[PDB]
Amino acid sequence: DNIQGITKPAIRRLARRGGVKRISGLIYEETRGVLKVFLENVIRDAVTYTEHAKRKTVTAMDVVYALKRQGRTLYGFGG
Amino acid sequence: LRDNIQGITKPAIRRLARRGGVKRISGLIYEETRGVLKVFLENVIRDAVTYTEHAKRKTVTAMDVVYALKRQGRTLYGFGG
Amino acid sequence: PGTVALREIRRYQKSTELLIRKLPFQRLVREIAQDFKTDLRFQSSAVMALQEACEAYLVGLFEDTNLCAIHAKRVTIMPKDIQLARRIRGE
Amino acid sequence: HRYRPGTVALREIRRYQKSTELLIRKLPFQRLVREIAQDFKTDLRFQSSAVMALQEACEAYLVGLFEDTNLCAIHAKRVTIMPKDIQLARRIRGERA
Amino acid sequence: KTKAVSRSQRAGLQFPVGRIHRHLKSRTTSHGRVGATAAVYSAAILEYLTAEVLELAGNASKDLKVKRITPRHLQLAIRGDEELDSLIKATIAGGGVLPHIHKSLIGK
Amino acid sequence: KAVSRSQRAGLQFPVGRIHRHLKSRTTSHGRVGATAAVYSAAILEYLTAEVLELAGNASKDLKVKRITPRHLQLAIRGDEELDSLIKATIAGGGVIPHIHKSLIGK
Amino acid sequence: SRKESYSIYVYKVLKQVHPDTGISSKAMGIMNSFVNDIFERIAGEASRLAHYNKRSTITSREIQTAVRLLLPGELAKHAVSEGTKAVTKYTS
Amino acid sequence: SRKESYSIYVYKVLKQVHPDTGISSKAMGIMNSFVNDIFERIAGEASRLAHYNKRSTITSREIQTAVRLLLPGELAKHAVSEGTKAVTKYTSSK
DNA sequence: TGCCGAGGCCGCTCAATTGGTCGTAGACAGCTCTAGCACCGCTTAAACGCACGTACGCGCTGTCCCCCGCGTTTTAACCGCCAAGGGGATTACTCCCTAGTCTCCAGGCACGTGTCAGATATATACATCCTGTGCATGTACTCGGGATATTG
DNA sequence: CAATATCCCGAGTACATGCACAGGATGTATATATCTGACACGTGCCTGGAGACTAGGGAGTAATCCCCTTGGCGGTTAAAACGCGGGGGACAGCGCGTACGTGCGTTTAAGCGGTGCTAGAGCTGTCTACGACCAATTGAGCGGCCTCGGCA
């Protein structure tokens, strides 16, 4: 399944940027849980703004507006 | 005004604590919690006075403080708006 | 032993009264506004609408603070727990 | 020759805390956002730059969650992070319970 | 000149379709509030005041009292799983708190 | 010869492209001309705080051309600001170095 | 001068679901606040939706989308199924 | 087709404050976005003071109050000064 | 043999919770407003939405070769338990300050109405600021070789 | 002291900036218009102040034992490094959809005329709910009965 491609060393890199020294082996399968739910919650909104406008490709602006709605704004792709 | 933050007397902080579900309160919680409450009052009554100054009123009114709360993610139901 | 402190929890989680004395809280809010402007007048319902929002913030913070004391295997809440609950919350 | 356990973990902090590059592989994350999407609307298409704005937002969320998690482990006398730490951080920020 | 039949009764709704149209126009809206979009908005307002009163009187009954005082809101609005998400931002004045002792603080 | 309203305020930013923007976010009613000249110069003036505080960064690294690993490594370091931009991640911006005092060797 | 409130429609709806029951005045102010908070959130989101797509009007779909963003869960698919009754009856 | 952005004005301000310097095409995306975001906050929030007082028209004294709600600390005290200068120059020439 | 203290079963009686019954005072729900201001119906002109056509951008899909992730395993230091020691958080009590109520009395100023001019909208004509485009060359990069720093 | 590593400096260069250019669409001018709201002016609510009294609560003290913290431990579960494996990241062609143009006509707004849905009342006038008092029950420990195990 495609979620297992968020590989163990990738979680370690993300964690290392965040500043943690030593990682329990239970954190790998638990962290995937929080990434999987976070993507679920912004893709619902991005596909909602898509279905509204009748087009059927998700644009960068759609994921920008979805992220903006939930208080997790990004400057980068179009404010 | 003199020193009126001392009027949040120790027992009252214990009541608030007791509502919140805590058993044992170290003696340094009292002087810390006054610090948290004074910072919250400053950051809401400043907005409430700026809503007042816009309308050329002197009297601060319930809607001013409710609009002040509403913008900080802390909406209050009970006084209208 | 250790039971009367727990008997208070079951009391204050049933009543919905305001828990800070009214006049002492009202005189504090008059103090804090003077450094924003001199000679405000406060509408009697404005002072209440502050108190209702304060108590609801304080008691939310003690709910979120206790969770940290439990995390450290303690029972007693301490300032280092309030500090954590505010830092992790983003205040 | 071989270093002490601990030496290389602090070497990695000073590396990945100085770069700004993306940390998850492209294709494995691109497969994941497609699978989560097709449960809500069949036969989507994505613009090439939409999935990038997902990735740059995800990494910045994960990295923030760990930064707030380590604060819990440090408070609880440990240095190792464990699931019970994430469940605390994520409850005080109001996400899950 | 054939009497009148209010837009509420035509829709099948107890909420005021006319009043809401005149509220939407002269909200922070753009310049063209269609009339069918005040009926799909009295509805998706009245539906909460069913789905959130239905369960609230549902608990005033359980405490054996007739009139829904304020805590009976809190004990639903911050107890039903979907309402707790819709109303995150709301403090119910005089509403109290949902009672709970942490399972680790009770002895034995 | 037409003047421009930017020159009468003394501003680099477009005072009349604003105004036209505000006139599209307006209930059903109009917007005073003296608003565009206190709307602008309170959008300029964040520039020359957002840019400007990069004196403390780009020049210090001996590199020319501002790039996204700056603004970050500044906007989240100066702290009168930060509050204005908490709501925003910076794409391709990384994070400031730290390491907490209990993880480093004792 | 008149002050205007939703106070009668919440009472009318209470007698729809609990015919014996009532509301205290202090517990009316809650509904009279809540019901206009959800008004504003729908108006504000529907307004932005029209702007992003550079429309001027706000038809039914400009609101059905604003409800399908803003409501959390089963409440979305219920409220959408409820509002599509109302306009379907109105247009007869 | 064509799009409007603040791309030229930020460069024109950059050359006012760091004459030797420039700015990447990746960094322009950010600045343009920061400028849009602060604009939409001020303009979107300014509508509400017009509702609360039941006034029709958006006005300088109204915007001045929006940029002391939305700005923290000393940043507000500077923006409020700077914009007042700009209006005083405009109204002295019309 | 014996002796006779230690050990194992049944009512009194004080203290929380819980469910029950009384009675006196506001605060809900029901009329009558009725006067009244908005929703509604009936014309109309016109803005803008919806739905074809079709042009050509760019997102999906097939091909080849390296970093990276997967798998091992030793061993180290961390998480974990547990036992003991001190003092600080609680409890119970008496004395004390002052919150809470009612009561009178003043006058700031919230609130709403009446005037009329200062202000911004809307049109037409028009000219110059900005967008998209194509272009040389300088910056910032990736690499290789050696110096300095720091771990074990 | 040896070794792996980070730091640092100069060469060679594929590409992104910052500019000049054509030109187009929107900012600006000059004039006409009307209605929002600034200014003046009352009326009246109510924010405030000062008094006296009862009694709920807070303050300060004394005794104690519950908890927090430090120390020492035995063990498992991570970090490091190596060796091996598979799969990410770098490459042209189709045709599907976003995007722009043209056109029809559904539908909202604006003005006007008429009356009922709705909101300030009365001091309504009951009748829920709030204190205030009451009776049952559970729970627990202590003071009285009867058999047996270890001791003379």
Cβ partners under 8 Å of residue F79, min gap 6:
none
Give, for B53, the enclosing helix (H) or strand (E).
Answer: helix B29-54
CATH of the domain at E3: 1.10.20.10
Residue F70's closest CA among A63, H21, D38? Answer: H21
Angle, vertex CA B66, rays to CA B65 and CA B68, nearest 5: 60
**What's the token pair of residue C12?**
């204050």
Euclidean distance between CA atoms F49 and F77, whole angstroms: 13
Euclidean distance between CA atoms A28 and H11, whole angstroms: 45
Domain count, chain F: 2
Under an 8 Å CB criterion, which residues of A touch G? 45, 48-49, 51-53, 61, 65, 69
**What's the token pair of residue F14?**
């477009």
Ordered by where they begin, the domains of chain A are: 1-77 (1.10.20.10)
> Is residue E104 domain-resident?
no
CATH number of G7-90: 1.10.20.10
Resolved by: cryo-EM
Cβ partners under 8 Å of residue C51, min gap 6:
C18, C20, C22, C25
Chains C+H touching (3+ CB pairs under 8 Å)? no
Question: Residue F34: which domain range?
Answer: 5-47
Under an 8 Å CB criterion, which residues of E touch H? 28
Euclidean distance between CA atoms G66 and G52, whole angstroms: 13
SS3 F2: coil
In sequence order, the β-bridge partners of residue B41 are none
C9-91 is classed CATH 1.10.20.10? yes
Give, for H32, the enclosing helix (H) or strand (E).
Answer: helix H25-53
Question: If 0-12 CB within 10 Å is exposed, 13-18 middle and 19+ buried, where does residue E9 land?
Answer: exposed
The nucleotide minimizing the C1' distance to residue D2's CA is: J80
Q: What is the CA radius of gyration of chain C?
A: 17
- Whether the CB-CB separation of E89 and E58 falls below 8 Å is answered with no
Cβ of B50 within 8 Å of Cβ of H68? The answer is: yes
SS3 E68: strand
Pick the CATH number of H7-91 from 1.10.4100.10, 3.30.365.10, 3.40.50.1100, 1.10.20.10: 1.10.20.10
- Whether the CB-CB separation of B57 and B65 falls below 8 Å is answered with no
Euclidean distance between CA atoms D74 and B81, whole angstroms: 43
Task: Kindly report the three-state secondary structure assignment for every residue of chain C.
Answer: CCCHHHHHHHHHCCCCCCCCCHHHHHHHHHHHHHCCCCCCEECHHHHHHHHHHHHHHHHHHHHHHHHHHHHCCCCEECHHHHHHHHHHHCC
- Whether the CB-CB separation of G39 and G31 falls below 8 Å is answered with no
Cβ of H69 within 8 Å of Cβ of B53? The answer is: no
Euclidean distance between CA atoms B63 and B51, whole angstroms: 9
Domain D13-96 top-level CATH class: mainly alpha
Helices (H) and strands (E) in chain B, counts: 3, 3
One domain, residues E30 and E13: yes
A73: closest CA of chain H, how far (Å): 10
> Is residue F101 domain-resident?
no
Question: If 0-12 CB within 10 Å is exposed, 13-18 middle and 19+ buried, where does residue G9 land?
Answer: buried
Cβ partners under 8 Å of residue A31, min gap 6:
A11, D62, D86
Cβ of E27 within 8 Å of Cβ of F27? The answer is: yes
Q: What residue segments make up the domains of chain H, in order of their start?
A: 7-91
**What's the token pair of residue E87?**
């109303």
- Whether the CB-CB separation of E16 and E43 falls below 8 Å is answered with no
The nucleotide minimizing the C1' distance to residue D50's CA is: I59
One domain, residues E2 and E42: yes
Protein C48 CA to nucleic acid I8 C1', in Å?
65
> Is residue E107 domain-resident?
no
Question: If 0-12 CB within 10 Å is exposed, 13-18 middle and 19+ buried, where does residue A79 land?
Answer: buried
- Whether the CB-CB separation of F70 and F57 falls below 8 Å is answered with yes
Euclidean distance between CA atoms D65 and F25, whole angstroms: 36
The nucleotide minimizing the C1' distance to residue C47's CA is: J47
B55: closest CA of chain H, how far (Å): 7
Residue D55's closest CA among G43, E35, A74? Answer: A74
> Is residue F106 domain-resident?
no
> Is residue F104 domain-resident?
no
Euclidean distance between CA atoms E69 and G22, whole angstroms: 9
| 23-82 on C, CB < 7 Å from strand J | 40-45, 69, 74-76, 78
Nearest-CA residue of chain H relative to F55?
Answer: H18
CA dist F99 → B31, B57, D17, D67, F75 (Å): 30, 51, 9, 10, 20
Angle, vertex CA C41, rays to CA C37 and CA C45, nearest 5: 125
E91: closest CA of chain B, how far (Å): 5
Euclidean distance between CA atoms F106 and A63, whole angstroms: 45
Euclidean distance between CA atoms B20 and E99, whole angstroms: 9
